[PDB]
């Protein structure tokens, strides 16, 4: 399915930028887990059963804490705050875990996964843009001279017979097939010059900004 | 079949300028070789072509030219067997 | 050339520094607390750490990254000629101020407490620039951002305000004592706002999943449900989701910028300006315009 890899390039094509910030939540989550082992040790307490105490202490040492905030921090909706204990309010650190848990929320989870989020978001929006234009380019100007659709306007000629025989691609193709083929002394004035255009890499023989549609009026004029 | 068909299917017209800045129209027979091109690679050809820094396409379209001539011989051989 | 050399290779200095960094805060977050060129690094610290031990190990790492920072500082001061520009200019320099401080922040890790080093790892935030432009993404809309947490504070506030004058009753908290389970929460106006802002803009569901759960026969059971739902609607679908939408907002306005300065750098010639498509079927092209004729 083309579509279903579409939906996937949009997140492919900003992949870098998604791991960054999986880094930088990384880092804030280690940063967290430094300030919970220092100051708020006590309170990291978690349930576990036990295959045949319910609860005990995750922050002994700094690998668990981090494992712990970093697993059961950013899965849970509220963030870390919601599997520490819950903290007395009239007991004397209550403000200060009520800020940790606070700006964990405002710093980890609404504008660090969100950030991913609009990373993949700017990636949709870009990767239709592009499509659009792309869309537009080939069917509003020709392959090989590329001139624009509203220039074979008000004339005998019109665009997509301009397209379909005057200036068809695989009519040069077929041309250049005929030159490489042909022998060199059977070759004509007009094939011999591409020929020797060929021989000497420069490609100036296509047509470029101009077609004899449009100079019809020019001849006229002349 | 029809007389005027191997005589009028294999014809084409192109443009070209000249030296002289001169544009002139060339119509030149479609060698039989140029008949066995596959559908589907002209699909492709003609969507992945990208713009190159003038915004004109025919620079890699012409260096495509070549895989093309061999995709077609080889197309050749295939329809003998 | 002493001077020179030591500037020529500012990569490097850099590069090692950052690296150093890495592997210096791996190692304390791997093991604290305790008693190609980047993989050839690696063998190194692991070996020293086999035989001279994570404490002489760090020391060294230590040591090693002050050496190079300070060279680093040095360096970038001679090579930028901060000097030249005014001595009141380098001190007022932002890139200076920054490093100063990092110069800093590694001698307090040296000597003041190992876990200093951990902050060290913001450098990462300039060393990617794909990182900082995410960052900017949120910092150059930080003010709406700012208000509209000070507009969702206010509905915080106005909604306690209702819940002490009515539902009052209704506020109880579950808590665990450290060596009843359950008590009010809201019994004091300010107590009433850190509950409600602290547990219901957490909560998914809000306000509601805090307070204890409304009997459906119960006679103010509607009030309850339109209270909830109104918090619902009005705090967590409205509110927290508008910051989010400023946050998109702002990340296409800056693919916006980058693409039409992006478009016009590559699209016109610095001095004149002229666009590329004035040069078309002419003997010179706009590649030799830029090139030589028009060569700032
Ligand atoms: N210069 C061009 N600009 C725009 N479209 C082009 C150009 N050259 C070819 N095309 C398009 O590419 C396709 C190739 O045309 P082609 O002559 O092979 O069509 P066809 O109908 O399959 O052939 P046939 O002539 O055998 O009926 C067609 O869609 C044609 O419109
Ligand atoms: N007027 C201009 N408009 C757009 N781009 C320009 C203009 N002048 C220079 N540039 C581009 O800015 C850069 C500066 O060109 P410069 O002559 O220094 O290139 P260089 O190849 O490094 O030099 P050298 O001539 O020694 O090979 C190049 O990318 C050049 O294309
Ligand atoms: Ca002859
Ligand atoms: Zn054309
Ligand atoms: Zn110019």
């Given at each position: 399915?083309?579509?279903?890899?579409?939906?996937?390039?949009?997140?492919?094509?900003?992949?870098?930028?998604?791991?960054?910030?999986?880094?930088?939540?990384?880092?804030?989550?280690?940063?967290?887990?430094?300030?919970?082992?220092?100051?708020?040790?006590?309170?990291?307490?978690?349930?576990?059963?036990?295959?045949?105490?319910?609860?005990?202490?995750?922050?002994?040492?700094?690998?668990?804490?981090?494992?712990?905030?970093?697993?059961?921090?950013?899965?849970?909706?509220?963030?870390?705050?919601?599997?520490?204990?819950?903290?007395?309010?009239?007991?004397?650190?209550?403000?200060?875990?009520?800020?940790?848990?606070?700006?964990?929320?405002?710093?980890?989870?609404?504008?660090?996964?969100?950030?991913?989020?609009?990373?993949?978001?700017?990636?949709?929006?870009?990767?239709?843009?592009?499509?659009?234009?792309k869309?537009?380019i080939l069917?509003?100007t020709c392959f090989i001279?590329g001139?624009?659709?509203?220039?074979?306007?008000?004339?005998?000629?019109?665009?997509?017979?301009?397209?379909?025989?005057?200036?068809?691609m695989?009519?040069?193709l077929?041309?250049?097939?005929?030159?490489?083929?042909?022998?060199?002394?059977?070759?004509?004035?007009?094939?011999?010059?591409?020929?020797?255009?060929?021989?000497?890499?420069?490609?100036?023989?296509?047509?470029?900004?101009?077609?004899?549609?449009?100079?019809?009026?020019?001849?006229?004029?002349? | 079949?029809?007389?005027?068909?191997?005589?009028?299917?294999?014809?084409?017209?192109?443009?070209?300028?000249?030296?002289?800045?001169?544009?002139?129209?060339?119509?030149?027979?479609?060698?039989?070789?140029?008949?066995?091109?596959?559908?589907?690679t002209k699909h492709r050809l003609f969507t992945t072509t990208e713009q190159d820094?003038?915004g004109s396409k025919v620079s890699d379209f012409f260096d495509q030219s070549?895989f093309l001539?061999?995709?077609?011989?080889?197309?050749?051989?295939?329809?003998?067997? | 050339?002493?001077?020179?050399?030591?500037?020529?290779?500012?990569?490097?200095?850099?590069?090692?520094?950052?690296?150093?960094?890495?592997?210096?805060?791996?190692?304390?977050?791997?093991?604290?607390?305790?008693?190609?060129?980047?993989?050839?690094?690696?063998?190194?610290?692991?070996?020293?750490?086999?035989?001279?031990?994570?404490?002489?190990?760090?020391?060294?790492?230590?040591?090693?990254?002050?050496?190079?920072?300070?060279?680093?500082?040095?360096?970038?001061?001679?090579?930028?000629?901060?000097?030249?520009?005014?001595?009141?200019?380098?001190?007022?320099?932002?890139?200076?101020?920054?490093?100063?401080?990092?110069?800093?922040?590694?001698?307090?890790?040296?000597?003041?407490?190992?876990?200093?080093?951990?902050?060290?790892?913001?450098?990462?935030?300039?060393?990617?620039?794909?990182?900082?432009?995410?960052?900017?993404?949120?910092?150059?809309?930080?003010?709406?951002?700012?208000?509209?947490?000070?507009?969702?504070?206010?509905?915080?506030?106005?909604?306690?305000?209702?819940?002490?004058?009515?539902?009052?009753?209704?506020?109880?908290?579950?808590?665990?004592?450290?060596?009843?389970?359950?008590?009010?929460?809201?019994?004091?106006?300010?107590?009433?706002?850190?509950?409600?802002?602290?547990?219901?803009?957490?909560?998914?569901?809000?306000?509601?999943?805090?307070?204890?759960?409304?009997?459906?026969?119960?006679?103010?059971?509607?009030?309850?449900?339109?209270?909830?739902?109104?918090?619902?609607?009005?705090?967590?679908?409205?509110?927290?989701?508008?910051?989010?939408?400023?946050?998109?907002?702002?990340?296409?306005?800056?693919?916006?910028?980058?693409?039409?300065?992006?478009?016009?750098?590559?699209?016109?010639?610095?001095?004149?300006?002229?666009?590329?498509?004035?040069?078309?079927?002419?003997?010179?092209?706009?590649?030799?315009?830029?090139?030589?004729?028009?060569?700032?």
């Amino acid at each position: 399915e083309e579509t279903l890899f579409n939906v996937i390039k949009s997140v492919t094509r900003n992949g870098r930028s998604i791991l960054l910030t999986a880094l930088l939540a990384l880092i804030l989550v280690y940063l967290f887990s430094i300030v919970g082992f220092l100051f708020l040790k006590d309170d990291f307490i978690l349930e576990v059963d036990r295959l045949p105490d319910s609860t005990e202490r995750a922050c002994d040492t700094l690998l668990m804490c981090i494992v712990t905030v970093m697993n059961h921090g950013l899965r849970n909706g509220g963030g870390v705050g919601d599997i520490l204990r819950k903290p007395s309010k009239d007991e004397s650190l209550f403000p200060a875990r009520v800020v940790y848990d606070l700006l964990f929320f405002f710093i980890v989870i609404i504008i660090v996964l969100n950030l991913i989020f609009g990373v993949i978001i700017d990636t949709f929006a870009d990767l239709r843009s592009e499509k659009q234009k792309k869309e537009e380019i080939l069917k509003t100007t020709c392959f090989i001279c590329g001139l624009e659709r509203d220039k074979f306007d008000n004339k005998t000629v019109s665009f997509e017979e301009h397209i379909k025989l005057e200036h068809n691609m695989w009519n040069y193709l077929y041309f250049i097939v005929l030159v490489r083929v042909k022998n060199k002394t059977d070759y004509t004035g007009p094939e011999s010059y591409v020929a020797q255009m060929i021989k000497n890499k420069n490609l100036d023989w296509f047509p470029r900004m101009r077609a004899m549609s449009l100079v019809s009026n020019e001849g006229e004029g002349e | 079949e029809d007389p005027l068909a191997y005589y009028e299917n294999h014809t084409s017209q192109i443009e070209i300028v000249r030296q002289d800045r001169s544009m002139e129209q060339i119509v030149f027979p479609v060698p039989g070789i140029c008949q066995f091109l596959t559908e589907e690679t002209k699909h492709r050809l003609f969507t992945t072509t990208e713009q190159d820094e003038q915004g004109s396409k025919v620079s890699d379209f012409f260096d495509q030219s070549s895989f093309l001539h061999n995709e077609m011989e080889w197309q050749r051989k295939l329809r003998s067997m | 050339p002493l001077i020179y050399w030591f500037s020529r290779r500012m990569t490097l200095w850099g590069s090692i520094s950052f690296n150093l960094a890495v592997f210096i805060n791996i190692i304390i977050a791997f093991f604290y607390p305790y008693m190609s060129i980047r993989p050839l690094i690696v063998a190194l610290i692991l070996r020293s750490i086999y035989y001279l031990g994570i404490g002489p190990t760090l020391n060294i790492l230590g040591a090693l990254n002050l050496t190079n920072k300070i060279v680093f500082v040095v360096s970038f001061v001679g090579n930028r000629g901060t000097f030249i520009r005014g001595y009141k200019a380098m001190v007022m320099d932002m890139e200076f101020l920054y490093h100063v401080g990092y110069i800093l922040t590694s001698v307090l890790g040296l000597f003041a407490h190992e876990l200093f080093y951990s902050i060290l790892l913001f450098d990462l935030i300039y060393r990617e620039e794909t990182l900082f432009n995410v960052i900017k993404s949120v910092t150059r809309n930080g003010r709406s951002i700012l208000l509209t947490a000070l507009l969702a504070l206010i509905l915080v506030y106005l909604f306690s305000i209702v819940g002490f004058l009515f539902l009052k009753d209704d506020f109880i908290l579950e808590v665990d004592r450290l060596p009843d389970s359950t008590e009010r929460a809201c019994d004091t106006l300010l107590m009433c706002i850190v509950t409600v802002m602290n547990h219901g803009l957490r909560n998914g569901g809000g306000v509601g999943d805090i307070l204890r759960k409304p009997s459906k026969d119960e006679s103010l059971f509607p009030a309850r449900v339109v209270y909830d739902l109104l918090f619902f609607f009005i705090v967590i679908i409205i509110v927290l989701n508008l910051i989010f939408g400023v946050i998109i907002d702002t990340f296409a306005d800056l693919r916006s910028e980058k693409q039409k300065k992006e478009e016009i750098l590559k699209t016109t010639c610095f001095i004149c300006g002229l666009e590329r498509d004035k040069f078309d079927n002419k003997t010179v092209s706009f590649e030799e315009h830029i090139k030589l004729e028009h060569n700032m």
